[PDB]
């Protein structure tokens, strides 16, 4: 897949399993169109969101439902979600791994982009 | 102020200066209503966004224009911006510091919430 | 002070208070010579470690006792400590802020170096 | 392997390739004994450091030579290295992934521990 999302839990030192992830693409009218969604697996990874032909140039938003993840563990976290917004494929097709490392009052996100 | 934003640059080891920050409150119709904005100071800090009276309970979005910052430095960035979305004051008024540490392909954000 | 250390807790969204910090200078024989130490304040900050005269060029180690902090909170940690090792003042005296953001299984450290 | 190290570059959004990594184990006399070493591959991963039978309980230090990585890219970074120190296998054998995300003036490190 040209787009993979990986989510880790910095409290438990584990993959963050069953985290909902929604992907949107900015349409010509500037609205966010639903693009793909899924949940992280037991390895904290979400594969198969899209294909090379569907994943054309554009601005994409990945929204990771971090609040439901923490709430299910009993925690009332700070953030409603973790959103990552980015222009994709501007210089031709690339493969993107969007990684997120989650704590109740902090998160980090990183992209690894390969050709 | 009950809300302060602080932005750091992990490439130069410095405050991130003159970074545009916009704050929104979620409206009854789920749209984002612009509320306050500013540019970070020489210390990477943005003070005076709001007041205790005005900063009522609700869902808030802080959008940090990370792409303009990296463009100003001649460095290719990944993200269009860094967004932080949170519910405020759920258990009473708090002082919020939203800190963001920026790299071209990664950012982290942390909330320091004090009483 | 030319050297300040600031520690934040990503689980509680707070300064990390009463965290032990030890600073060492590398000796001619490659051993670590203890130099200064302290505990972070209510703001997570440790000031007054050293002075401009004393803080000459050299390699310095800051060891943050993250394991004691997490043990005090009843939370199982991964690391024995967080170490930060750096060469100081290579291009002249600077003011260094060493910031660390702590989670039980992850930490980040950043230097803010100003003139 | 029960111990894997993965290193990423937050400036370029890429694996950090050919990074030297040295692992030490604390001996009964409290000294650091060399345990294993290697370099990250094209995927920024270092596999094969040890075996399940060799990787007994103990305190381990992983030193990642982040300074040589940056210097080879023309950058004079803040840190001399990134060190991660941890007790392993205290509650029986586990598999450890030590991940490090590198910027010139910042790094983060995370452990994913699985059973
Ligand atoms: O988020 C921070 C951080 C991110 C990665 C590593 C270490 C600290 C951070 C860095 C520096 C400061 C702060 C603060 C609050 C919350 C986070 C940080 C803060 O109040 N101040 O003054 C910092 O300098
Ligand atoms: O973002 C990561 C990170 C966050 C904080 C500290 C160290 C690494 C991170 C952790 C683990 C993995 C990855 C990956 C890509 C990008 C970032 C990470 C990745 O591909 N894999 O396999 C990781 O395990």
Coordinates of C-alpha atoms and ligand atoms in Angstrom, one line a residue:
Chain A
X1 CA 0.0 0.0 0.0
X2 CA 1.2 3.6 -0.7
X3 CA -0.3 4.7 2.7
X4 CA 0.2 2.9 6.0
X5 CA -0.6 4.3 9.5
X6 CA 1.2 2.9 12.6
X7 CA 0.2 3.9 16.1
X8 CA 2.2 3.2 19.3
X9 CA 1.3 3.7 23.0
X10 CA 4.1 5.4 25.0
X11 CA 2.6 4.5 28.4
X12 CA 2.4 0.7 27.9
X13 CA 5.3 0.4 25.4
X14 CA 3.1 -1.4 22.9
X15 CA 1.2 -1.1 19.7
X16 CA -2.0 0.9 20.0
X17 CA -4.5 -1.7 18.9
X18 CA -8.0 -1.1 17.4
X19 CA -7.5 2.6 17.0
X20 CA -10.0 4.1 14.4
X21 CA -8.4 6.1 11.6
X22 CA -10.2 8.2 9.0
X23 CA -8.6 9.6 5.9
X24 CA -10.0 12.5 3.9
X25 CA -8.9 14.2 0.7
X26 CA -9.4 17.8 -0.1
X27 CA -11.8 18.2 -3.0
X28 CA -11.7 20.9 -5.7
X29 CA -14.3 22.9 -3.8
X30 CA -12.0 22.9 -0.7
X31 CA -14.1 20.5 1.4
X32 CA -12.8 17.3 3.0
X33 CA -14.1 14.2 1.1
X34 CA -14.0 10.9 2.9
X35 CA -11.2 8.8 1.3
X36 CA -10.7 5.7 3.4
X37 CA -10.9 4.4 7.0
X38 CA -9.9 1.5 9.1
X39 CA -8.7 0.3 12.5
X40 CA -5.2 -0.6 13.7
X41 CA -4.4 -4.3 13.9
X42 CA -2.6 -6.1 16.8
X43 CA 0.7 -4.8 15.5
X44 CA -0.7 -1.2 15.7
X45 CA -0.6 -1.0 11.9
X46 CA -3.3 -0.2 9.4
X47 CA -2.6 -1.5 5.9
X48 CA -4.7 -1.5 2.7
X49 CA -6.3 1.9 3.0
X50 CA -5.7 2.7 -0.7
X51 CA -4.0 1.8 -4.0
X52 CA -1.3 3.4 -6.1
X53 CA -3.9 4.4 -8.8
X54 CA -6.5 5.8 -6.3
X55 CA -3.9 7.7 -4.2
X56 CA -3.4 10.6 -6.7
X57 CA -1.8 14.0 -5.9
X58 CA -3.7 16.0 -3.3
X59 CA -4.0 17.2 0.2
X60 CA -4.9 14.4 2.6
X61 CA -6.0 14.4 6.3
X62 CA -5.5 11.4 8.5
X63 CA -7.5 11.7 11.8
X64 CA -6.6 9.2 14.4
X65 CA -9.2 8.7 17.2
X66 CA -6.8 8.8 20.1
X67 CA -9.5 10.0 22.6
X68 CA -11.6 6.7 22.2
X69 CA -8.3 4.7 22.6
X70 CA -7.5 6.3 26.0
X71 CA -11.1 6.4 27.2
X72 CA -11.3 2.6 26.7
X73 CA -8.3 2.3 29.0
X74 CA -10.0 4.5 31.7
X75 CA -8.1 7.7 30.8
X76 CA -9.5 11.1 30.0
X77 CA -6.8 12.4 27.6
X78 CA -6.1 15.9 26.5
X79 CA -6.6 15.7 22.8
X80 CA -9.8 14.9 20.9
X81 CA -7.8 13.2 18.1
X82 CA -4.4 13.4 16.4
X83 CA -4.7 14.9 12.9
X84 CA -2.0 14.8 10.2
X85 CA -2.5 16.9 7.1
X86 CA -0.1 16.7 4.2
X87 CA 0.3 17.2 0.4
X88 CA 1.0 13.8 -1.2
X89 CA 2.6 12.8 -4.5
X90 CA 3.6 16.3 -5.5
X91 CA 6.9 15.1 -7.1
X92 CA 5.4 11.8 -8.3
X93 CA 4.1 8.7 -6.4
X94 CA 5.6 7.9 -3.0
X95 CA 4.9 5.5 -0.2
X96 CA 3.9 7.1 3.1
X97 CA 4.1 5.7 6.6
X98 CA 2.4 8.0 9.1
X99 CA 3.4 7.0 12.6
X100 CA 1.9 8.4 15.8
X101 CA 3.2 7.9 19.3
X102 CA 0.5 8.5 22.0
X103 CA 0.5 9.6 25.6
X104 CA -2.5 11.0 27.5
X105 CA -1.3 14.6 27.3
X106 CA 1.0 14.4 24.3
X107 CA 1.5 12.9 20.9
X108 CA 4.1 12.9 18.2
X109 CA 3.7 12.2 14.6
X110 CA 6.3 11.4 12.0
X111 CA 6.2 10.6 8.3
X112 CA 8.6 8.2 6.5
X113 CA 8.3 8.8 2.8
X114 CA 10.0 6.5 0.4
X115 CA 10.4 6.3 -3.4
Chain B
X1 CA -3.6 34.3 30.2
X2 CA -5.4 30.9 30.5
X3 CA -3.9 29.8 27.1
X4 CA -0.3 30.1 26.0
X5 CA 1.3 28.5 23.0
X6 CA 5.0 27.7 22.8
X7 CA 6.8 26.5 19.6
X8 CA 10.4 25.1 19.4
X9 CA 12.5 24.3 16.4
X10 CA 14.3 20.9 16.7
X11 CA 16.5 21.6 13.6
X12 CA 18.1 24.9 14.9
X13 CA 17.7 24.2 18.6
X14 CA 15.8 27.5 19.1
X15 CA 12.5 29.0 19.7
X16 CA 10.4 29.0 16.6
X17 CA 9.9 32.8 16.0
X18 CA 7.1 34.5 14.0
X19 CA 5.1 31.4 13.6
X20 CA 1.4 32.1 12.9
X21 CA -1.1 30.5 15.3
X22 CA -4.9 30.5 15.0
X23 CA -7.3 29.5 17.6
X24 CA -10.9 28.3 16.9
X25 CA -13.9 27.4 19.0
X26 CA -16.3 24.7 17.8
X27 CA -19.7 26.2 17.0
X28 CA -23.1 24.6 17.7
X29 CA -23.2 23.5 14.0
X30 CA -19.7 21.8 14.2
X31 CA -18.0 24.4 12.2
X32 CA -14.8 26.1 13.5
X33 CA -15.3 29.6 14.6
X34 CA -12.1 31.7 14.6
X35 CA -11.5 33.2 18.1
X36 CA -7.9 34.5 18.4
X37 CA -4.6 34.5 16.6
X38 CA -1.1 35.8 16.9
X39 CA 2.6 35.2 15.9
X40 CA 5.1 33.6 18.3
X41 CA 7.6 36.0 19.9
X42 CA 11.4 35.9 20.0
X43 CA 11.0 33.3 22.8
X44 CA 8.7 31.1 20.7
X45 CA 5.8 32.1 22.9
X46 CA 2.4 33.5 22.2
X47 CA 0.6 35.1 25.1
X48 CA -2.7 37.0 25.5
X49 CA -4.8 34.9 23.2
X50 CA -7.7 35.1 25.5
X51 CA -9.1 35.9 28.9
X52 CA -10.5 34.0 31.8
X53 CA -14.0 35.3 31.0
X54 CA -14.0 34.5 27.4
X55 CA -12.3 31.1 27.6
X56 CA -15.4 29.1 28.6
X57 CA -15.8 25.3 28.3
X58 CA -15.9 24.0 24.8
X59 CA -13.8 22.3 22.1
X60 CA -10.9 24.4 20.8
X61 CA -8.6 24.0 17.9
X62 CA -5.1 25.5 17.8
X63 CA -3.6 25.6 14.3
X64 CA 0.1 26.3 14.0
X65 CA 1.4 27.3 10.5
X66 CA 4.4 25.1 10.5
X67 CA 4.6 25.0 6.7
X68 CA 5.1 28.8 6.4
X69 CA 7.8 28.5 9.1
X70 CA 9.8 25.8 7.2
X71 CA 9.3 27.6 3.9
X72 CA 10.8 30.8 5.4
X73 CA 13.9 28.7 6.3
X74 CA 14.3 27.1 2.9
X75 CA 13.5 23.7 4.3
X76 CA 11.0 21.3 2.6
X77 CA 8.3 20.3 5.1
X78 CA 5.9 17.4 5.3
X79 CA 2.8 18.8 7.1
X80 CA 0.4 21.6 5.9
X81 CA 0.2 22.7 9.6
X82 CA 0.1 21.3 13.1
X83 CA -3.4 21.2 14.6
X84 CA -4.2 20.6 18.3
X85 CA -7.8 19.9 19.3
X86 CA -8.9 19.7 22.9
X87 CA -11.8 20.1 25.2
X88 CA -11.2 23.0 27.6
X89 CA -12.0 23.4 31.3
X90 CA -14.0 20.2 31.6
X91 CA -13.4 20.1 35.4
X92 CA -13.1 23.9 35.9
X93 CA -10.9 26.7 34.5
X94 CA -7.2 25.7 34.0
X95 CA -4.1 27.4 32.6
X96 CA -3.1 25.6 29.4
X97 CA 0.3 25.7 27.8
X98 CA 0.3 24.1 24.4
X99 CA 3.8 23.3 23.4
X100 CA 4.9 22.1 20.0
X101 CA 8.3 20.8 18.9
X102 CA 8.8 21.1 15.2
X103 CA 10.9 19.1 12.7
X104 CA 10.4 19.1 8.9
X105 CA 8.9 15.7 8.8
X106 CA 7.7 15.3 12.4
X107 CA 6.1 17.3 15.2
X108 CA 5.1 16.6 18.8
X109 CA 2.6 18.5 20.9
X110 CA 2.2 18.4 24.6
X111 CA -0.2 20.2 27.0
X112 CA 0.9 21.4 30.4
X113 CA -2.3 22.0 32.4
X114 CA -1.9 23.7 35.8
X115 CA -4.2 25.0 38.5
Chain C
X1 CA 22.4 30.6 34.5
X2 CA 24.0 29.2 31.3
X3 CA 22.4 25.8 31.9
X4 CA 18.8 25.1 32.8
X5 CA 16.9 21.8 32.7
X6 CA 13.2 21.5 32.3
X7 CA 11.2 18.3 32.7
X8 CA 7.5 17.6 31.6
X9 CA 5.2 14.7 32.3
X10 CA 3.3 13.6 29.2
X11 CA 1.0 11.3 31.2
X12 CA -0.3 13.9 33.7
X13 CA 0.1 17.0 31.5
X14 CA 2.2 18.7 34.1
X15 CA 5.7 19.8 35.0
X16 CA 7.6 16.8 36.3
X17 CA 8.4 18.0 40.0
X18 CA 11.1 16.8 42.3
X19 CA 13.0 14.9 39.6
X20 CA 16.7 14.4 40.5
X21 CA 19.1 15.7 37.9
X22 CA 22.9 15.2 37.9
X23 CA 25.4 17.0 35.7
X24 CA 28.8 15.6 34.9
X25 CA 31.9 16.9 32.9
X26 CA 34.0 14.5 31.0
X27 CA 37.5 14.3 32.6
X28 CA 40.9 13.9 30.7
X29 CA 40.7 10.1 31.4
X30 CA 37.2 9.8 29.8
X31 CA 35.5 9.3 33.2
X32 CA 32.5 11.3 34.2
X33 CA 33.2 13.8 36.9
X34 CA 30.1 14.9 38.9
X35 CA 29.7 18.8 38.6
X36 CA 26.3 19.9 39.8
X37 CA 22.9 18.5 40.7
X38 CA 19.5 19.4 41.9
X39 CA 15.8 18.5 41.9
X40 CA 13.2 20.1 39.5
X41 CA 11.0 22.8 41.0
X42 CA 7.1 23.0 41.0
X43 CA 7.5 24.4 37.5
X44 CA 9.6 21.3 36.4
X45 CA 12.6 23.6 36.1
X46 CA 16.1 23.4 37.6
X47 CA 18.0 26.6 37.7
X48 CA 21.4 27.7 39.1
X49 CA 23.4 24.5 38.2
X50 CA 26.4 26.4 37.2
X51 CA 27.9 29.9 36.4
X52 CA 29.4 31.5 33.3
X53 CA 32.9 31.2 34.7
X54 CA 32.6 27.5 35.6
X55 CA 30.8 26.3 32.5
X56 CA 33.8 26.1 30.2
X57 CA 34.0 24.2 26.9
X58 CA 33.9 20.5 27.3
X59 CA 31.6 17.4 27.0
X60 CA 28.8 17.4 29.6
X61 CA 26.3 14.7 30.6
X62 CA 22.9 15.5 32.2
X63 CA 21.4 12.4 33.8
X64 CA 17.7 12.7 34.7
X65 CA 16.4 10.2 37.2
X66 CA 13.2 9.3 35.3
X67 CA 12.9 5.8 36.9
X68 CA 12.5 7.3 40.5
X69 CA 9.9 9.8 39.2
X70 CA 7.7 7.0 37.7
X71 CA 8.2 4.8 40.7
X72 CA 7.0 7.7 42.9
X73 CA 3.8 7.7 40.8
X74 CA 3.2 4.0 40.9
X75 CA 3.8 3.7 37.1
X76 CA 6.1 1.0 35.6
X77 CA 8.8 2.6 33.6
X78 CA 11.1 1.3 30.8
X79 CA 14.3 3.4 31.2
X80 CA 16.8 3.4 34.1
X81 CA 17.2 7.2 33.4
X82 CA 17.4 9.7 30.6
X83 CA 20.9 10.8 29.7
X84 CA 21.8 13.8 27.6
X85 CA 25.4 14.2 26.4
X86 CA 26.6 17.2 24.5
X87 CA 29.6 19.4 23.8
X88 CA 29.3 22.8 25.3
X89 CA 30.2 26.2 24.0
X90 CA 32.0 25.0 20.9
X91 CA 31.6 28.4 19.2
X92 CA 31.5 30.5 22.4
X93 CA 29.4 30.6 25.6
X94 CA 25.7 29.9 25.0
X95 CA 22.6 29.6 27.3
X96 CA 21.4 26.1 27.2
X97 CA 17.9 24.8 28.1
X98 CA 17.7 21.0 28.1
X99 CA 14.1 20.0 28.0
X100 CA 12.9 16.5 28.5
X101 CA 9.3 15.2 27.9
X102 CA 8.7 12.0 29.8
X103 CA 6.4 9.0 29.3
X104 CA 6.8 5.6 30.9
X105 CA 8.1 3.9 27.8
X106 CA 9.4 6.9 25.8
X107 CA 11.2 10.2 26.3
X108 CA 12.3 13.0 24.1
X109 CA 15.0 15.6 24.8
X110 CA 15.5 18.9 23.0
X111 CA 18.1 21.6 23.4
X112 CA 17.2 25.3 23.1
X113 CA 20.5 27.2 22.6
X114 CA 20.3 31.0 22.7
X115 CA 22.8 33.9 22.5
Chain D
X1 CA 15.8 -11.4 17.4
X2 CA 14.8 -10.4 20.9
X3 CA 16.4 -7.0 20.4
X4 CA 16.0 -4.7 17.3
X5 CA 16.9 -1.0 17.0
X6 CA 15.2 1.2 14.5
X7 CA 16.4 4.8 13.7
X8 CA 14.5 7.4 11.8
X9 CA 15.5 10.9 10.5
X10 CA 12.9 13.6 11.3
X11 CA 14.5 16.2 8.9
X12 CA 14.4 14.1 5.7
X13 CA 11.4 11.8 6.7
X14 CA 13.4 8.7 6.0
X15 CA 15.2 5.8 7.7
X16 CA 18.5 6.8 9.2
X17 CA 20.8 4.5 7.3
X18 CA 24.3 3.2 8.4
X19 CA 24.0 4.5 11.9
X20 CA 26.5 2.8 14.3
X21 CA 24.9 1.2 17.4
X22 CA 26.8 -0.3 20.3
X23 CA 25.1 -2.4 23.0
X24 CA 26.6 -3.0 26.5
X25 CA 25.5 -5.1 29.5
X26 CA 26.1 -4.2 33.1
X27 CA 28.5 -6.7 34.6
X28 CA 28.4 -8.0 38.2
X29 CA 31.2 -5.5 39.1
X30 CA 29.0 -2.6 37.8
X31 CA 31.1 -1.9 34.6
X32 CA 29.6 -1.8 31.1
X33 CA 30.7 -4.9 29.1
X34 CA 30.5 -4.8 25.3
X35 CA 27.5 -7.0 24.3
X36 CA 26.9 -6.5 20.6
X37 CA 27.2 -3.8 17.9
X38 CA 26.1 -3.2 14.3
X39 CA 24.9 -0.5 11.8
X40 CA 21.4 0.3 10.6
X41 CA 20.4 -1.1 7.2
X42 CA 18.6 0.7 4.3
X43 CA 15.4 0.4 6.3
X44 CA 17.0 2.1 9.3
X45 CA 16.7 -1.2 11.2
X46 CA 19.4 -3.3 13.0
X47 CA 18.5 -6.9 13.4
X48 CA 20.5 -9.9 14.6
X49 CA 22.2 -8.3 17.6
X50 CA 21.6 -11.2 19.9
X51 CA 19.8 -14.4 20.6
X52 CA 17.1 -15.4 23.1
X53 CA 19.6 -17.5 25.1
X54 CA 22.3 -14.9 25.2
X55 CA 20.0 -12.0 26.1
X56 CA 19.6 -12.9 29.7
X57 CA 18.2 -10.6 32.5
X58 CA 20.3 -7.6 33.0
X59 CA 20.7 -3.8 32.6
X60 CA 21.5 -3.0 29.0
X61 CA 22.8 0.2 27.3
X62 CA 22.2 0.9 23.6
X63 CA 24.4 3.8 22.4
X64 CA 23.4 5.2 19.0
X65 CA 26.0 7.2 17.2
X66 CA 23.8 10.1 16.1
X67 CA 26.7 12.6 15.9
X68 CA 28.5 10.8 13.1
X69 CA 25.1 10.5 11.2
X70 CA 24.5 14.2 11.3
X71 CA 28.2 15.2 10.6
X72 CA 28.2 13.0 7.5
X73 CA 25.2 15.1 6.3
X74 CA 27.1 18.3 7.0
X75 CA 25.4 19.1 10.3
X76 CA 26.9 19.8 13.7
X77 CA 24.3 18.4 16.0
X78 CA 23.7 19.0 19.7
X79 CA 24.0 15.5 21.1
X80 CA 27.1 13.3 21.1
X81 CA 24.9 10.2 20.9
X82 CA 21.5 8.9 21.9
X83 CA 21.8 6.4 24.8
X84 CA 19.0 4.2 26.0
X85 CA 19.5 2.3 29.3
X86 CA 17.0 -0.3 30.5
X87 CA 16.5 -3.5 32.6
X88 CA 15.6 -6.4 30.3
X89 CA 13.7 -9.6 30.9
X90 CA 12.9 -9.0 34.5
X91 CA 9.5 -10.7 34.2
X92 CA 10.8 -13.3 31.8
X93 CA 11.9 -13.1 28.2
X94 CA 10.5 -10.3 26.0
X95 CA 11.2 -8.9 22.6
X96 CA 12.4 -5.3 22.5
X97 CA 12.2 -2.8 19.7
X98 CA 14.2 0.4 20.6
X99 CA 13.2 3.2 18.2
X100 CA 14.9 6.5 17.9
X101 CA 13.7 9.6 16.0
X102 CA 16.5 12.0 15.3
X103 CA 16.7 15.8 14.6
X104 CA 19.8 17.9 14.9
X105 CA 18.9 19.4 18.3
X106 CA 16.4 16.8 19.6
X107 CA 15.8 13.1 19.7
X108 CA 13.1 10.8 21.0
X109 CA 13.3 7.2 21.9
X110 CA 10.5 4.7 22.5
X111 CA 10.4 1.0 23.4
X112 CA 7.9 -1.5 22.2
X113 CA 8.0 -4.6 24.4
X114 CA 6.2 -7.7 23.4
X115 CA 5.6 -11.1 25.0
Ligands
LIG1 O1 7.1 19.9 24.6 C1 8.3 20.1 25.0 C2 9.3 19.2 24.8 C3 9.2 18.4 23.6 C4 10.2 17.5 23.4 C5 11.2 17.3 24.3 C6 11.3 18.0 25.4 C7 10.3 19.0 25.7 C8 8.7 21.3 25.6 C9 9.9 21.9 25.4 C10 10.3 23.1 26.0 C11 9.3 23.7 26.8 C12 8.1 23.1 27.0 C13 7.2 23.8 27.9 C14 5.9 23.2 28.1 C15 5.6 22.0 27.5 C16 6.5 21.3 26.6 C17 7.8 21.9 26.4 C18 7.5 25.0 28.5 O2 6.7 25.5 29.2 N1 8.7 25.5 28.3 O3 9.1 26.7 28.9 C19 9.6 25.0 27.5 O4 10.7 25.5 27.3
LIG2 O1 7.6 7.6 15.1 C1 8.3 6.8 15.7 C2 9.0 7.2 16.8 C3 8.4 8.1 17.7 C4 9.1 8.5 18.8 C5 10.4 8.0 19.1 C6 11.0 7.1 18.2 C7 10.3 6.7 17.1 C8 8.3 5.5 15.3 C9 8.3 4.4 16.1 C10 8.3 3.1 15.6 C11 8.2 2.8 14.3 C12 8.2 3.9 13.4 C13 8.1 3.7 12.0 C14 8.1 4.8 11.1 C15 8.1 6.1 11.6 C16 8.2 6.3 13.0 C17 8.2 5.2 13.9 C18 8.1 2.4 11.6 O2 8.1 2.2 10.4 N1 8.2 1.3 12.4 O3 8.2 0.0 11.9 C19 8.2 1.5 13.8 O4 8.3 0.6 14.5

